[PDB]
């Protein structure tokens, strides 16, 4: 489970990992301090974020992003990108002339932190608005709700 899989060293920029230790008081890797924050609006930090080891600069809990703006929801449809998933948001648009609605949808590419493991296609995810993380990504997954049709 190597973390350093890139050409540059991966580490949380806040945590200093070169502090001097004591020889007689150290036997094995003692601890690596973990940087994590609690995002607002009542969202609880997942356990895997606090006690994990992954490095994600776009993670809402262990990264540099701040959640602000719209809190949305959607269902996972594709998981074929690194730390990024595609969710679909279905809604009904009212046509005034016919007094009726039509089904419409929009796909949003949202960032999924490694603190959410075993997220499946069809799960309901709560996303929060953040700064542009890529060309199309502007939302971060904050909570994953398992689908009713799951194990």
């Amino acid at each position: 489970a190597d973390i350093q899989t890139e050409r540059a060293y991966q580490k949380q920029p806040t945590i200093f990992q070169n502090k001097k230790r004591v020889l007689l008081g150290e036997t094995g890797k003692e601890k690596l301090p973990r940087y994590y924050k609690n995002i607002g609006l009542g969202f609880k930090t997942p356990k895997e974020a606090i006690e994990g080891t992954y490095i994600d600069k776009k993670c809402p809990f262990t990264g540099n992003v701040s959640i602000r703006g719209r809190i949305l929801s959607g269902v996972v449809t594709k998981m074929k990108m690194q730390r990024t998933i595609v969710i679909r948001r279905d809604y009904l648009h009212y046509i005034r002339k016919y007094n009726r609605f039509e089904k419409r949808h929009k796909n949003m590419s949202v960032h999924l932190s490694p603190c959410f493991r075993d997220v499946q296609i069809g799960d309901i995810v709560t996303v929060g608005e953040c700064r542009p993380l890529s060309k199309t990504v502007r939302f971060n997954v904050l909570k994953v709700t398992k689908a009713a049709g799951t194990k």
Binding site: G40, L41, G42, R68, I71
Partner: protein
């Protein structure tokens, strides 16, 4: 496009200036200052349109350049200077002082005050921050930075400052039961007692206010300006005491006044 605009079309001006459309193409574009463009009152509007002391903008310029107008105790020669909520306008030559207070219809009333009450004003604080070697600071709705404020003064409270020295004299906490004024929106100009505040994290808070006659309304927290402790005001209220009358009672009072007076 290409840098800031310097004109204001007369029909794009704030509606509470009560400007008419046939006078000209332009309205006096208020200069930058302690108050926002859409919720201020340019000195020319007050001196010409309200007080009728001048007939044209040239006469307003003459009055202002004679150093007769004092806003918050300072002589202001700018005829488009933005004067706003709780600002004190003192004209020493004619010996009258005005305080810019919204009337119940959302417009700046010509509210005359005694010279004793013209020596201070109420300022809602916008932020408190610590800077420059642990020195607390305080920013008001009037864009005044007051150093070394009382540690009990937090955001959304209103302080009372003496105009001559520019120092905090007293303050009122933001709490239920305190009298307040609405400075924006549909209920702008109304005066009542704060009854309940609903907090919406990540969004705007809602404050519920009740009048003296029991009418209850609500507005966003940014639009609340607490006037006094409890139900008594620290400043003098306009001819209407912040009560908004429905059009039926307005018409009834107008008809009764027409009947009684001949």
């Amino acid at each position: 496009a290409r840098g800031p605009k310097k004109h204001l079309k007369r029909v794009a001006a704030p509606k509470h200036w009560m400007l008419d459309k046939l006078t000209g193409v332009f309205a006096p574009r208020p200069s930058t200052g302690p108050h926002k463009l859409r919720e201020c009152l340019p000195l020319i509007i007050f001196l010409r349109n309200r007080l009728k002391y001048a007939l044209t903008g040239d006469e307003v310029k003459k009055i202002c350049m004679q150093r007769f107008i004092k806003i918050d105790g300072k002589v202001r020669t700018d005829i488009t200077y933005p004067a706003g909520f709780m600002d004190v306008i003192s004209i020493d030559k004619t010996g009258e002082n005005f305080r810019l207070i919204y009337d119940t219809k959302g417009r700046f009333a010509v509210h005359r005050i005694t010279p004793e009450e013209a020596k201070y004003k109420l300022c809602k604080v916008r932020k408190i921050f610590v800077g420059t070697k642990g020195i607390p600071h305080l920013v008001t709705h009037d864009a005044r930075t007051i150093r070394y404020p009382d540690p009990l003064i937090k955001v959304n409270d209103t302080i009372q400052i003496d105009l001559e020295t520019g120092k905090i004299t007293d303050f009122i906490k933001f709490d239920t039961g305190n009298l307040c004024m609405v400075t924006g929106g549909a209920n702008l100009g109304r005066i009542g007692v704060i009854t309940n505040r609903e907090r919406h994290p990540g969004s705007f808070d809602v404050v519920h206010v009740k009048d003296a006659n029991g009418n209850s309304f609500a507005t966003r927290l940014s639009n609340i300006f607490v006037i006094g402790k409890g139900n008594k005001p620290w400043i003098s209220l306009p001819r209407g005491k912040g009560i908004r009358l429905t059009i039926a009672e307005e018409r009834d009072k107008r008809l009764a006044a027409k009947q009684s007076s001949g």
